[PDB]
Structure 1
Amino acid sequence: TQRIASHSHVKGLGLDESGLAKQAASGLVGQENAREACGVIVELIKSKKMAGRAVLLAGPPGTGKTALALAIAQELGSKVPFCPMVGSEVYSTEIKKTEVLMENFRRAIGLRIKETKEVYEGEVTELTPCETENPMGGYGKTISHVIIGLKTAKGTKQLKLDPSIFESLQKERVEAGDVIYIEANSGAVKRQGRCDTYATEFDLEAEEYVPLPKGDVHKKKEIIQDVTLHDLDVANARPQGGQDILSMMGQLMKPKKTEITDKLRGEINKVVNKYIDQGIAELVPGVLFVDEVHMLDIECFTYLHRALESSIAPIVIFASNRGNCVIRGTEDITSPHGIPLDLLDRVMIIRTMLYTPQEMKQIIKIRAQTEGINISEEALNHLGEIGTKTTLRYSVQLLTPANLLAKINGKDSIEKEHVEEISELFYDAKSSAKI
């Protein structure tokens, strides 16, 4: 299911090799200076040299601030994490605002952790070659080595493992004919189950028979797991393993999202650095796109302009849509963009001008193309004219309903009559203001 979203045509900033801006910028049109600033900041992000830097996508409504935000996000690629957040999400009834902001900052930061493990598997043929008793002591019966005949699909390879592991072999039901999961360093044996070759159709049992391993006995499984710092925080927050945690009444209330700074910073950062400099993981700072930043309370901005001061804070892309308005939580304290004047000094303002009527027509045409419906020249011109009259977002919403009206009327392309009828069946707020 394609499930076309509101604005999915944006695929990237579409900047030329020289870094300038063009019209057909991979879905997004116009906004030359804004897209160039987006390119500069995405180059910054890719550099991964600076932290705690914020940028403000100030601009009137309809300038496609969220559009260019998703464009730069896609340009960054799925490699680096991108956590979208709206100012309303900060208001939580169970966890304070600043801690939600810190959790979002952590989510915005990524971390790839590699893990290589040398493991041996295959059908076992246990046999202990009798050896003279310990030569340092007396005589008797001892075992200096324990040979395990691991048989894999590719062949057979006997391993003369250490004799001390014999306890593990006897611990689990390791009988001749089952698949075992050996570990190089640890040596612990974990039986996977009997081989399917012995799973007679008349034997009723499940989870006990497994297929033979494909490949050499010695396998060096390399696996990479990308988890944000917030994932590690949550994992180390709650407990696991016994301790009467199975209770329902006094424990089912899992929403204990409350978090402290000691655990968040400190030990977690240190272990992350140890994994980084040791070669076990690679840090991947992402981006935190915060739209409707003006909706945050002053208690949120006062914590933002302090968290951005930290060396670990990721890149934040604020997108304020309102203009000069009183800061929330303050007594008639008017500030530009609804953001305190102190935080605006820490953010780079990327201004976005209004779309030219030609840009409106281009946007309408590319949205119609993405939708997959053909529109005649006259219909497209009428759509552009009405998008110039009222908000541009009204025109793009008139494509699908006009398309369905055309399809039901027996015609394929959206004729001017269809859009004309839809404009009278549906209209915008500017016309609805006539109460």
Structure 2
Amino acid sequence: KIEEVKSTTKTQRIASHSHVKGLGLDESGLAKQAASGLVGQENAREACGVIVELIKSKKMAGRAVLLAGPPGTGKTALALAIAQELGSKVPFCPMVGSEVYSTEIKKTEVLMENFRRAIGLRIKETKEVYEGEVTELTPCETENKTISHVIIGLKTAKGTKQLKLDPSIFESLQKERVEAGDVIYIEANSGAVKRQGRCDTYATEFDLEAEEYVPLPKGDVHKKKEIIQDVTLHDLDVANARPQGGQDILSMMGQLMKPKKTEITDKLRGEINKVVNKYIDQGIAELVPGVLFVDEVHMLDIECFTYLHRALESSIAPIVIFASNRGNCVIRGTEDITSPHGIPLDLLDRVMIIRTMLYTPQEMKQIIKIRAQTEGINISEEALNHLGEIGTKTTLRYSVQLLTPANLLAKINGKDSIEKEHVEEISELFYDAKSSAKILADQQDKY
């Protein structure tokens, strides 16, 4: 009769690009007027439909596209649209142009770390494991005393079996404090041992106890399973740089040291390339190269604008997306040479420039309405028009910013929607980047 429901988990927060859901193109390759949260920029959204096909062709390697335009014109919005269109499986690497300055590794090497992180890989691995409750454990002895064999009895639901294992497995078992009656899970690819606690049968033995009890495992004592794994080249490279696998003492104690980055040499990269090629030839490894997104590219030091010449002419380097919003500026680290967008001409010749233009007042209202319905606020027509004129006066970012506090004041006094009075009062409370400049230049002598 009485219907009751429960819902206590909170929703996700709203970012600055939470409404962009795709490029919103058509099958013919043209650009709509308003689709998937994007309006306008037809000449730029159409040019981004070529790029997604270029990514999905898995053919080229070492192509760069540079999005250029005034601030607030939707560069990174287009980049996130491309990333959303390409799907989750394709690896996407966000990056800021100011991250190449590090105190541990050189500027040049971070670019490689990001390139190798951009390229993905899919592996179909097979792991054979022995699981179950230990019923008997015995270390064998031989001539020096040393240990040569380990005898382990594992009892699953199906039954029990006895196994002879390498002394390294015995060392790992003694390391984890494994006795009889404790459920264990050993994998034979790496020799790792995991203890889950005593069996559920030994529950009433002790009135007071601290160990957790797991039920008896079901299935066979020894079994192999297939695991599908998504990895990148940079994961293999970093794992082989400072290894942590294995049950020895060198890697165990390397697991505890401070994780400092290191400069990977060309030899390890080449050997990893050979190994992954061998994996591909076996019909298991599938390559899925992705996209690296470099934002604010205009502030890479000249030592990074020039290594990219050799870094992009490679046959492995993925597709790189640049983004800049600067005019004829001086190149950082040069103090004498000026160039468009800060990027030098020599590197600029290797990129395809996607021009971006400023927005018209008509699209401003549509963008504001889309953002308002994304946040979850209701705005009247006159208030939306007033926000439109405000945006035409200063910028659309300011209009988007004003949407939330206006709703706050609207819901303070019982109103359910934003009115013109709320927008005007908010515009009075907060200042623009240009009005504040005026009131600052008026009193410049006294600051």
Question: Which category describes the TM-score, using the shorter chain as reference length?
Answer: 0.7 to 0.9
Indicate how the Cα distance of structure 1 residues 292 and 131 shifts in structure 2: closer, same or farther if over 3 A, else same.
closer
CA contact (8 A) 1:82 1:288 kept: yes
Indicate how the Cα distance of structure 1 residues 121 and 22 shifts in structure 2: closer, same or farther if over 3 A, else same.
same
| Alpha-carbon separation, structure 1, partners of 2:362 and 2:296 | 28
Unaligned ranges ≥5, structure 1:
135-140
The TM-score normalised by the length of structure 2 is 0.81
2:183 match: secondary structure = strand
Q: CA deviation at 1:211?
A: 1.7
| Alpha-carbon separation, structure 2, partners of 1:343 and 1:43 | 24
Judge which range, 166-175 or 387-396, deviates more: 166-175
| Alpha-carbon separation, structure 1, partners of 2:376 and 2:107 | 43
| Alpha-carbon separation, structure 1, partners of 2:75 and 2:121 | 28
CA contact (8 A) 2:192 2:247 kept: no
| Alpha-carbon separation, structure 1, partners of 2:49 and 2:79 | 11
Q: CA deviation at 1:130?
A: 19
Instruction: Say whether residues 1:246 and 2:256 are aligned partners.
Output: no
Indicate how the Cα distance of structure 1 residues 200 and 86 shifts in structure 2: closer, same or farther if over 3 A, else same.
same
Unaligned ranges ≥5, structure 2:
1-10, 440-447
Indicate how the Cα distance of structure 1 residues 376 and 202 shifts in structure 2: closer, same or farther if over 3 A, else same.
same
Q: CA deviation at 1:318?
A: 0.1
Deviations 1:377-421 (A, max 9, x none): 000111111111211111000000111111113211000111111
Deviations 1:46-104 (A, max 9, x none): 22211111110111111110111111111122212211111111122332211111111
CA contact (8 A) 2:172 2:247 kept: no
The TM-score normalised by the length of structure 1 is 0.83
Q: CA deviation at 1:331?
A: 3.5
2:434 match: secondary structure = helix
Q: CA deviation at 1:305?
A: 1.7
CA contact (8 A) 2:168 2:247 kept: no
1:348 match: secondary structure = strand
Judge which range, 342-351 or 264-273, deviates more: 264-273
CA contact (8 A) 1:52 1:316 kept: yes
Q: CA deviation at 1:200?
A: 2.3
Judge which range, 77-86 or 175-184, deviates more: 175-184
| Alpha-carbon separation, structure 2, partners of 1:92 and 1:124 | 50
Q: CA deviation at 1:272?
A: 2.0
2:147 match: secondary structure = coil
Indicate how the Cα distance of structure 1 residues 331 and 23 shifts in structure 2: closer, same or farther if over 3 A, else same.
same
| Alpha-carbon separation, structure 2, partners of 1:270 and 1:219 | 31
| Alpha-carbon separation, structure 2, partners of 1:167 and 1:120 | 16
CA contact (8 A) 2:243 2:251 kept: no
| Alpha-carbon separation, structure 2, partners of 1:331 and 1:167 | 61
CA contact (8 A) 2:132 2:183 kept: yes
1:284 match: secondary structure = strand
1:89 match: secondary structure = coil
1:101 match: secondary structure = helix
RMSD across aligned positions (CA): 5.1
2:293 match: secondary structure = strand
1:385 match: secondary structure = helix
Q: How does 1:116-135 map to 2 (within 5 A)?
A: 116-122=126-132
2:182 pairs with one of 168, 178, 188: 178
CA contact (8 A) 1:245 1:251 kept: no
Q: CA deviation at 1:206?
A: 5.2
1:424 match: secondary structure = helix
Number of paired residues? 429
CA contact (8 A) 2:120 2:289 kept: yes
Judge which range, 238-247 or 99-108, deviates more: 238-247
- Point out the structure with the larger strand share: 2
| Alpha-carbon separation, structure 1, partners of 2:438 and 2:195 | 76
2:98 match: secondary structure = helix
Judge which range, 169-178 or 108-117, deviates more: 169-178
Counting aligned pairs with the same residue, the percent is: 100
CA contact (8 A) 2:377 2:407 kept: yes
Indicate how the Cα distance of structure 1 residues 154 and 370 shifts in structure 2: closer, same or farther if over 3 A, else same.
farther
Judge which range, 150-159 or 109-118, deviates more: 150-159
Deviations 1:336-370 (A, max 9, x none): 21111111111111111222212111110000001
Indicate how the Cα distance of structure 1 residues 361 and 215 shifts in structure 2: closer, same or farther if over 3 A, else same.
farther
1:7 match: secondary structure = coil
Q: How does 1:30-429 map to 2 (within 5 A)?
A: 30-122=40-132, 152-153=156-157, 179=183, 181=185, 194-200=198-204, 202=206, 209-215=213-219, 219-240=223-244, 254=258, 256-429=260-433
CA contact (8 A) 2:198 2:211 kept: no
Indicate how the Cα distance of structure 1 residues 173 and 261 shifts in structure 2: closer, same or farther if over 3 A, else same.
closer
| Alpha-carbon separation, structure 1, partners of 2:18 and 2:381 | 24
Judge which range, 378-387 or 142-151, deviates more: 142-151
Indicate how the Cα distance of structure 1 residues 164 and 66 shifts in structure 2: closer, same or farther if over 3 A, else same.
closer
